[PDB]
Design a protein around this ligand. Structure first.
Ligand SMILES: NC(=O)C1=CN([C@@H]2O[C@H](COP(=O)(O)OP(=O)(O)OC[C@H]3O[C@@H](n4cnc5c(N)ncnc54)[C@H](O)[C@@H]3O)[C@@H](O)[C@H]2O)C=CC1
Ligand SMILES: NC(=O)C1=CN([C@@H]2O[C@H](COP(=O)(O)OP(=O)(O)OC[C@H]3O[C@@H](n4cnc5c(N)ncnc54)[C@H](O)[C@@H]3O)[C@@H](O)[C@H]2O)C=CC1
Ligand SMILES: NC(=O)C1=CN([C@@H]2O[C@H](COP(=O)(O)OP(=O)(O)OC[C@H]3O[C@@H](n4cnc5c(N)ncnc54)[C@H](O)[C@@H]3O)[C@@H](O)[C@H]2O)C=CC1
Ligand SMILES: NC(=O)C1=CN([C@@H]2O[C@H](COP(=O)(O)OP(=O)(O)OC[C@H]3O[C@@H](n4cnc5c(N)ncnc54)[C@H](O)[C@@H]3O)[C@@H](O)[C@H]2O)C=CC1
Ligand SMILES: O=C1O[C@@H](CO)[C@H](O)[C@@H](O)[C@@H]1O
Ligand SMILES: O=C1O[C@@H](CO)[C@H](O)[C@@H](O)[C@@H]1O
Ligand SMILES: O=C1O[C@@H](CO)[C@H](O)[C@@H](O)[C@@H]1O
Ligand SMILES: O=C1O[C@@H](CO)[C@H](O)[C@@H](O)[C@@H]1O
Lengths: 368, 366, 368, 367
């Protein structure tokens, strides 16, 4: 009863999934998942990485990975443009699916995938790995327990500078048709996954966006950048509470600055993913000792004890994916719900596309 | 020497008194003459005139402003009294150092702006967060192209002085007698910093909330009418984007005026709770690439007048000594003071525009 | 042709070694090591953890694991008092050894193990995993490149609070005979491993030490704490350069505070393991922009690109052990020297034991 | 009945004292001290700075300032080699003395000054201004209240880089005869003032020291730096508790890094003067919220409310000196004892000179 695993793609997220599947039973116990099929192109790369990743075989044929009888679950980590075709084929073949974010390039493709997931009766989860840190999970539990009273404001950002260099060449990812959203698709969807986990569903957005580098080098000429480098939005949650939201792929000096804070009637929680082992908690205290606490990640926080019994031994980015794999393992076993599945993921896609629509039309966008 | 009248002795009154006393110590020239202190009641004016070193105390602010030995008036009274006192001081031909915000309404600020122009006297408003060496260094770095072209501003001003729901109701929490809430107490400060970094505001879209809607009032409750918190998206006259917020109920924050300017070639970041640090990112070789912590010292504007050695932390109160020197130099015709009542009216239009936007659910253009 | 692995112990370090062996080829390439035998007591635990760790078999007899013909390298993660017996048996059986720190309870035992390692033509490495972070390795390279000129001062500390609470029960680890050193053995050896890597060898120490909680709950009575809760030393390096050194197991609020700085003639480097992804570098700059740089760990630093292509995705404590495994793998393949081996480890044992002696006699101890 | 003030020197500390005397009554109430005589050289500089500082007159003659009948108290902010002559003259003239640190160049000098202060029956205070921050004073009160349980370790450092540049010229401050100690005299004495205020008296030190830049430019040539650029020491307190101690004037990137922590059996306090408005306090808490608190300086802390009613409005370095002035003012009025006076200051001189002796001889020094 070991879970049979297929992996499609071996890049940033492909290798991250491979490391997660390899150690999920080391951390959490039970039977090690069997690493059956690795799909990647070209074939010589799939063969080489299948060998070093410990997959029983590599193939250049992604459909082989979704249709092998020894496969129960498929990790899909290919470019956004391929997610709908590969996820639907995996569900149609009766496989559980771990799909990297975002779901697809459009709300329409995500809607089709959401319907296909319901029809398949298989488990799905989307790769929102910033919801998996012990610090983030600890913050959600502290809010649930009334540690900061009633939330009254959310402020969140996700700054990186991977596109700040204007000489970085044009690519398909910078077109609407083949790339979908820009910073909202690469980073915004992550901040939404964290924001709605803390504050509940979004009822309304009003957004602005900018393209800072509007044209890029392309084969001796230049081509237009058609999606946003940065976006900001004001939020009304279904609770009526306010929010501030931003993302940027051109924010110089920032590498993984997913940073958020929840202000409540009885305290404040604050976090920055660049220091993912620290959670700042303010609660009213006597005047002589009053102030924010630095909570350093350790075994009191969800998931941490599976990796290390001693506090302050920093939890890493890649271990978030081991926690994500375990949540999908337990969901497949009927011992837990995985979040977000394709239904909860579709809502996230509607929010980021709603922000893009609001920025273009200059109108607030309402949900439900 | 400049003859000084001071009206009020509270948070800002005592801050102005300390500033007028040491402005020549820091910057040279003749010490201003501390001529008349006005406060109520008379006993308190006489007591604080003695300890603050003013030649006399009065309970009559009107005769304080009319005194021929007075050249300049510090006005540190509640918001509702700013218009009457500033107009009376300008009418008596005195220069005016007025605390923020200008008044309760744009209408009031417009009348004050007209009176200031008609008086041919110098005015400055108490936007003291524009006076830190770190802030002034950041403006100079942007002017030198240290971060290329600004592409985004993000600013906040969080405090928690009204977070306790048991704090009593006051006339400050009514629209008619209090004006704006967090936008008037804190928002105006963040605007003074934001437009100094990014230039004028073209458009705002705002949201606001009253978080604690009823407070204790005489064994009963009374309704809070103005906002505890407000947020806005900004479009600058330059076409650049901004994020803006303020709050008087943000638990754990005491003076968190924090801002960030992201440019095409770097980033500047600041937090007033650590007012001696300026964070600068510029691209560097990969082995050493990262933000620099610039600790305030004599390389930054104003610091060397207070201390010859870097890392000896500059204080909130010393911002007011810099503010006094800027007014002194304006009065001597050796510098232009910012913001005067004309510059100040623009800031009033922005915070009232944010309030209007939050009420209507519509953007406001300037 | 893949390395055959035996693992003895399954605790804090046992599980850390198991996760390292499982992902070393995922991160760095080549053939995944074969997880052949896991040894632990009792046998039921050995069989259970062999299953979840992915070892081919579990045994309650460690001697039988180190003699297995399918085993080439032995990870020893057992308590300090068993290190000598198990390392000597593994070397005698012709196996390479990955030994957890400290080497043993006494210099006498470390001396015997060092002679054994040498008598064998097998590779050894000791688990000084704080020398493996990208930030630390980056700092060593910056010093060698002259980024801070000549070191003029070292200041290092290693504070934790795992024994700070007077309520915490007595254990055999708090006796000289069965526990060996206190804070110097648990934490001090780690700080020495980092300090001599930055500054070069120790020539002289003058030390103080204290047992600050002298008795602890034991069987409804109390028992005496015999070894040190904290120790501090002034250092002279062979270079002539000065140092400050401390460790503590009773330092309230600290969880993994291995923190050090190197002050040089042309700059300063500063590091804190509780924020293991930040390296602080000061070099003189023009007055308007002069200040320390926060270098955030990313692919420019040694080892990081094997785990993640994007900077600011925090490297974790456990990933230090994957780097350590790779260094031992490459040393076994004859394509790099592993540090520290049992010879370099014996020097570290002599330094911490010299500090303990200096504190006891009130006299400096010389090593050269 | 206003206190009459003489100020000797107008440099870093002279101007800091001038600003403190000017606003001490503004902050704390009572009668503003009268700024009577400022002494500095040359005369035109004394006249110009007396005018801008608000002193009734300037003179080039420090003895004129000390002897003026309108003067009750003398601020002495001159170089270390002049402290003894000027302090003894002020005490002999019947004036209270606010003396900058360190007291003098030698223990022998400090002993003579300590005797002169007792004979004069005048108040003395030494300018250990880092003991005056609201954060420091709050930490001392928290330790006394048992907030960290029993102290078990002190670790303190004081790093600056004002001499890190080898091209900074030689001065008489860098000879032992005319300059006394190096980093131990400039910074070490400050760290001792904070350390003994937290941990009580020092019983034993073992120290090491180095001169990193042994020769400096002198009038186109070179001259020898005779005193230490950095020093480190292990401490035993009279309590039996351990300490670590260091100072440096060549620690690149540090500007005012007086940083200390006290570890106790029920908590830890930690502070860094470069962020002088933050005090870090760890006390045990339930595991879900356990961690250090950032205490931001505000009106709950000693002295702060005299300057500002609102927390988080950063208290400045210069306002430490306004607090120091107030402590001396109250001591003169018989309404409080000022610390350290020349008797408590002599003990601090013995500790820093004992560290220098320990570093020179390679032997521990007992007190
Ligand atoms: N959760 C997270 O933090 C992160 C998620 N991602 C997501 O990972 C996904 C991939 O990222 P990208 O930058 O687009 O590319 P990438 O190069 O990082 O990975 C794409 C992988 O898919 C393989 N591939 C491409 N076409 C294929 C085909 N037809 N059959 C089999 N394999 C194929 C490539 O060879 C490569 O191994 C995206 O959905 C992206 O949004 C990326 C970075 C971080
Ligand atoms: N720039 C800044 O950072 C700050 C500015 N302020 C501003 O300062 C002004 C006053 O607020 P605070 O100083 O906090 O209030 P406060 O209550 O501390 O001081 C008000 C002073 O005005 C006096 N006063 C009232 N009515 C008077 C009258 N008819 N004649 C003479 N004196 C009178 C009061 O007795 C008191 O001394 C406000 O406009 C406020 O917005 C306040 C705090 C900080
Ligand atoms: N490098 C580092 O960062 C760290 C190193 N260590 C070191 O790791 C070693 C073990 O400490 P922990 O892992 O914390 O202890 P632990 O109690 O968590 O693990 C000890 C393991 O050895 C096993 N064991 C004991 N006797 C055995 C026997 N006769 N045969 C087979 N297995 C046996 C135990 O069942 C247990 O699995 C120590 O040498 C310690 O100094 C510990 C923590 C961190
Ligand atoms: N407590 C603190 O934080 C600080 C204390 N200090 C102390 O302040 C004192 C002065 O500092 P330095 O660096 O030596 O010099 P400095 O140049 O900062 O100040 C010396 C002042 O004394 C004046 N002076 C020199 N000889 C004089 C004489 N014969 N008569 C009248 N005035 C004379 C100088 O013109 C100058 O105004 C020293 O004792 C030093 O330790 C210095 C900096 C900070
Ligand atoms: O999903 C992501 O997108 C990458 C860029 O495509 C970012 O670098 C990652 O930090 C982020 O996790
Ligand atoms: O203008 C201000 O208003 C006060 C509230 O009334 C805030 O506490 C101050 O920080 C701020 O400078
Ligand atoms: O080797 C170690 O010893 C443990 C205690 O035994 C500490 O908690 C660890 O941080 C350290 O790595
Ligand atoms: O007393 C002091 O000595 C100066 C050096 O002379 C340092 O720069 C100051 O920070 C220190 O307070």
């Amino acid at each position: 009863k070991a879970l049979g695993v297929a992996l499609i793609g071996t890049g940033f997220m492909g290798k991250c999934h491979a490391m997660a599947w390899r150690n999920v039973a080391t951390a959490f116990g039970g039977l090690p998942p069997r690493l059956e099929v690795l799909a990647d192109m070209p074939a010589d790369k799939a063969h080489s990485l299948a060998s070093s990743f410990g997959f029983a075989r590599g193939t250049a044929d992604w459909r082989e990975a979704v249709s092998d009888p020894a496969v129960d679950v498929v990790s899909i980590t290919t470019p956004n443009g391929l997610h709908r075709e590969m996820a639907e084929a995996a569900l149609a073949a009766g496989k559980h699916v771990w799909l990297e974010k975002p779901m697809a390039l459009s709300v329409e493709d995500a809607q089709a995938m959401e319907a296909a997931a319901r029809a398949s009766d298989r488990r799905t989860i989307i790769g929102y790995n910033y919801t998996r840190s012990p610090a983030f999970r600890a913050a959600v539990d502290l809010i649930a327990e009334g540690a900061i009273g009633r939330p009254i404001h959310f402020r969140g950002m996700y700054d990186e500078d991977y596109m700040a260099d204007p000489d970085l060449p044009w690519s398909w990812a910078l077109t609407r048709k083949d790339g979908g959203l820009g910073a909202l698709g690469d980073l915004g969807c992550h901040l939404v996954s964290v924001m709605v986990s803390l504050m509940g569903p979004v009822a309304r957005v009003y957004a602005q966006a900018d393209t800072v580098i509007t044209d890029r080098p392309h084969q001796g000429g230049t081509a237009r950048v058609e999606n946003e480098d940065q976006a900001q939005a004001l939020i009304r949650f279904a609770s009526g509470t306010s929010g501030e939201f931003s993302c940027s792929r051109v924010a110089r000096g920032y590498r993984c600055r997913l940073a958020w804070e929840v202000q409540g009637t009885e305290g404040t929680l604050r976090f920055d993913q660049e220091r993912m082992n620290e959670l700042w908690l303010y609660q009213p205290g006597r005047p002589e000792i009053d102030g924010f606490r630095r909570i350093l990640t350790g075994p009191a926080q969800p998931g941490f004890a599976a990796f290390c019994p001693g506090g302050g031994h920093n939890f890493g980015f890649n271990e978030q994916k081991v926690v994500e794999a375990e949540m999908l393992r337990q969901a497949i076993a009927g011992r837990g719900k995985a979040w977000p599945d394709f239904t909860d993921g579709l809502t996230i896609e509607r929010v980021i596309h709603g922000m893009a629509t609001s920025a273009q039309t200059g109108q607030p966008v309402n949900f439900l």
